[PDB]
Chains A and B, each alone.
Chain A
Amino acid sequence: EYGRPFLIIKDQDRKSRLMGLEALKSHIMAAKAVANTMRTSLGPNGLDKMMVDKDGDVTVTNDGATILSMMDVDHQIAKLMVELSKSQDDEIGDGTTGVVVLAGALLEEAEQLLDRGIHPIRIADGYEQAARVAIEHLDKISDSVLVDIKDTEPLIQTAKTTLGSKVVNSCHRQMAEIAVNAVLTVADMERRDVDFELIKVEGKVGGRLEDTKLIKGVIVDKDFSHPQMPKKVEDAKIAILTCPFEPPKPKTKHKLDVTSVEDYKALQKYEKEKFEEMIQQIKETGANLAICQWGFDDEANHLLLQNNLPAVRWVGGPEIELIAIATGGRIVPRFSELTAEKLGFAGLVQEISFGTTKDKMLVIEQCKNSRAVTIFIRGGNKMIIEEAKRSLHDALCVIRNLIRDNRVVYGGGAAEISCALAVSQEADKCPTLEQYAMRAFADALEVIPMALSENSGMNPIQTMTEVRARQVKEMNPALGIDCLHKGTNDMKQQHVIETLIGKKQQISLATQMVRMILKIDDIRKPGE
């Protein structure tokens, strides 16, 4: 019948396919290249990566989420590792370069098992059993201290370690006090949540890195409408307005007809009485400063000046509701609704000036109990501000996690050495072709200590062996790697603290991605 090459799929001659084991080996090699790039950027002695944007821009960063985000890959498995780290930052915020290292090392250890004639589903089944032993062991060595306002210090020592890795280490004691003090202010203690819209992060280039401070009000980048207005006030009642200062105009298609001269003269009189009626209503209620969303007029600008009543023009949408929460006032949509009980209270409204430029900023502080605070980042470089903003976001996200869950564990590699012994000890009582999968899990779990030692300058196998030998002989699960050369391997004395839920996710989330990769056997993609 001469079974000539009949056509089955469209564009069959421009498509490729991988099947069997050769497709499984290509996944591992693709996930071994990605996870080996992020190994160097781990721990306090890590190094960061240069990134060049598609158009012309340059980014310097150490965060694991953003590095895999701005890196453009074409391999499909490499796009799965990018999403693995992104799903970690939004859930916790710390540990996004630690998951891809463990997942990459978890796949490499399975390469030898496959070559011996082991079904991939059997490997993905033994991995889940190990992850249930490590997580149940992590609660046993977890210690919860306390979280409140009066004794804050364990909270400071928690944010000190996460900031230890980033470039902000010269002043990292000061930047660990801003992160802790700006969270318990805006966070409720009954519902146990944090509203990050209530925290504003604003950076302005130029100056010094240690000039960063926490403002207990709202700082808006605008200035007074008239050049002859006083720059500072000492007792201001904030009059938040939404409506503009123009004469009213209905939204429907109004048309006003002028069919005489007296109708014309009665229109000029109408306009000028409407301006004077507005200033009378603001002054009557006792207001001292006017805040408006829309613009002023040429005539409504002098009346504010002539009556000793300064004002701010063209402020944004989101900034208005922060002044209302901070100053304690309310927002009025008209002038008729403006009463004495709808006014804010500021203690000091100044207009700070930067150097030889025309950049003026309005600051608002010395207020009562507030739920809105801002962070003012300074620095002498464009790339310093952007990286400083990223490092502060990680510090805030760590404290937010401690509000949900008080209990913590000790880092520096201590949690991994302890977890790898519980898995290996339990694998000795499982004779069903699972001890191999369990033993492979505990071997990839120890890559974290071997990445810190290699980066520090020490020998991995010489230091890691001595730590486990000391941990089994004693009963101290808080022994890690002396990366900073301080003399003691005891992490409790060195004050290295890690949140528990941060470590739980790095194991539960990393295991499940390995189950997808081990399940995939065929690829069908077009050819280029």
Chain B
Amino acid sequence: LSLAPVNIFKAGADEERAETARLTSFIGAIAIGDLVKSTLGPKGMD
């Protein structure tokens, strides 16, 4: 039911598979480009 009955990794180490890794890498990158977008162009803010 869990991530394989045996324990391979240590305590505190995490792993992400295909369906959830693409979720982290895609929300992490969009967050960076959203904070910065407001400072683009002749009339960008500060």
Interface residues of A (CB under 8 A from B): 26, 29-30, 33-34, 40, 50, 72-75, 78
Contacts and interface: CB of A to CB of B under 8 A. Distances in A.
Contact of B6 (A26, A40, A50, A72): A26
B21 interface: yes
A74 B10 contact: yes
Main secondary structure of the interface of B (DSSP, over half): loop
Contacts of A33: 4, 6, 8
B21 A30 contact: no
Contacts of A75: 6-8
A126 B4 CA distance: 30
Given A72-B9, A74-B10, 4 more contacts: A33-B4, A50-B25, A73-B9, A74-B7
B40 interface: no
B10 to A, nearest CB: 5
B7 to A, nearest CB: 7
A74 B9 contact: yes
Contact of A30 (B6, B13, B18, B25): B6
Interface string B16-46: 0010010001000000000000000000000
A75 B8 CA distance: 5
Most buried by A among B4, B5, B8, B10: B8
A29 B3 CA distance: 12
B8 A74 contact: yes
A30 B6 CA distance: 7
Nearest to B5: A29
A50 B25 CA distance: 10
**7 closest A-B pairs by CB:** A74-B10, A75-B8, A30-B6, A33-B4, A29-B6, A78-B8, A73-B8
A72 B7 CA distance: 12
Contacts of B13: 72
Nearest to B18: A40
B38 to A, nearest CB: 25
Contacts of A30: 6, 8
A143 B9 CA distance: 44
Nearest to A29: B6
A73 B10 contact: yes
Contacts of B6: 26, 29-30, 33, 75
